[PDB]
Design a binder for these strands. Structure first.
Length: 364
RNA sequence: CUGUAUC
């Protein structure tokens, strides 16, 4: 049956609710921005703030609002824009389904419109927005595919105070921080690079100056690991983080549930001179009561044993196109570790960690 | 005596 028929029978909102109805609507929504039926349908949907909002919140309704968006002419976008704002833009972001419309907007609108949109977000409580599991997707979208001058206001938000701490320590705001970084440090082969790098640095500063608390945190540790696994100018920060926070801190961090994951990756990605000083450090100061060196402590630790298996992994992998000078250095470490493990085998075998550490040393 | 997400 006809779209025109549906419109003329007052059945337009009824269709947009039904899971079948909506599919109908989408299929034969005219692509000609100039079609008379399309003008009628667009206006019927967008005439009422209440009805339009409700469509965004709809499990099914949102799909047609989306269709309206991807095909929206400039003039259409301004109507959609007004209605979003007049119907609580924030509450749209907090909604599972109204969210997708906000997001699609961001992609498909025009600079002018997107602008007032982002102008609008800026005025929200960016903090609360970044924690919300749903709301965050909107900022994710802004960052992950709009030019960084659009959302510099957001970088200034993170750099300001300790908004950053709050965000990267939060269950959901963590992935955002990773993505923002990914975004600022990307495409060395761009003229805009110079500006993004200054924004990364002010951000990266907060991160470095809290590395220890961050690395030990249930979520934030994933950001640290991000920085350490990175390729570009991120390597410069990898080195500073390792050099300032991780070194001299290896022993205690290796025993933290979360920071031991960081330590592991630091060992995997540290350049040879930083790796050499990590090893050097790990291999001895004996603890006051029952004098134990770092190595003994780690081997028997529940989280610590994982860092050691890492060191053992690293060494042997390297012992299978490198100079005989550093190759003899790795050899030095495997041996120190090999003897120690064999010395404690009778004690180690009592543990799952023990057995794996033992097996790994006998195989090689 | 085996040790953490977000999407």
């Amino acid at each position: 049956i006809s779209l025109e028929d549906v419109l003329l029978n007052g059945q337009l909102i009824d269709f947009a609710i039904d899971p079948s109805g909506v599919k109908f609507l989408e299929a034969n929504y005219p692509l000609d921005s100039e079609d008379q039926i399309r003008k009628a349908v667009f206006e019927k949907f967008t005439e009422s703030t209440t009805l339009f909002v409700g469509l965004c919140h709809s499990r099914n309704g949102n799909f047609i609002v989306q269709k309206l968006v991807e095909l929206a002419t400039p003039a259409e976008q301004r109507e959609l824009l007004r209605q979003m704002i007049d119907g609580g833009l924030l509450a749209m972001c907090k909604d599972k389904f109204a969210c997708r419309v906000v997001q699609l907007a961001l992609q498909k609108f025009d600079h002018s419109n997107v602008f007032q949109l982002i102008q609008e977000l800026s005025t929200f409580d960016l903090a609360a927005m970044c924690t919300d599991q749903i709301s965050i997707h909107v900022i994710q979208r802004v960052v992950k595919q709009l030019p960084v001058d659009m959302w510099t206001f957001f970088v200034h938000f993170l750099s300001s105070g300790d908004s950053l701490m709050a965000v990267c320590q939060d269950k959901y705001g963590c992935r955002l921080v990773q993505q923002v970084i990914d975004r600022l440090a990307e495409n060395p082969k761009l003229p805009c690079f110079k500006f993004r790098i200054q924004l990364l640095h002010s951000l990266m500063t907060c991160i470095v100056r809290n590395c220890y608390r961050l690395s030990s945190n249930e979520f934030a540790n994933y950001v640290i690991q991000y920085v350490i696994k990175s390729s570009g100018i991120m390597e410069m920060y990898r080195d500073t983080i390792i050099d300032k926070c991780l070194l001299r801190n290896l022993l205690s961090m290796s025993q933290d549930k979360y920071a031991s994951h960081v330590i592991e990756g630091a060992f995997l990605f540290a350049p040879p001179a930083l790796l050499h000083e990590m090893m050097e450090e790990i291999f001895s100061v004996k603890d006051v009561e029952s004098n134990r060196d770092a190595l003994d402590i780690l081997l028997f630790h529940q989280y610590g044993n994982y860092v050691v298996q890492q060191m053992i992994s690293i060494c042997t992998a390297a012992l299978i196109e490198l100079p005989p000078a550093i190759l003899l250095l790795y050899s030095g470490w495997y041996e120190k570790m090999k003897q120690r493990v064999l010395q404690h085998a009778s004690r180690l075998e009592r543990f799952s960690s023990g057995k794996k550490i033992i097996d790994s040393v006998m195989r090689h």
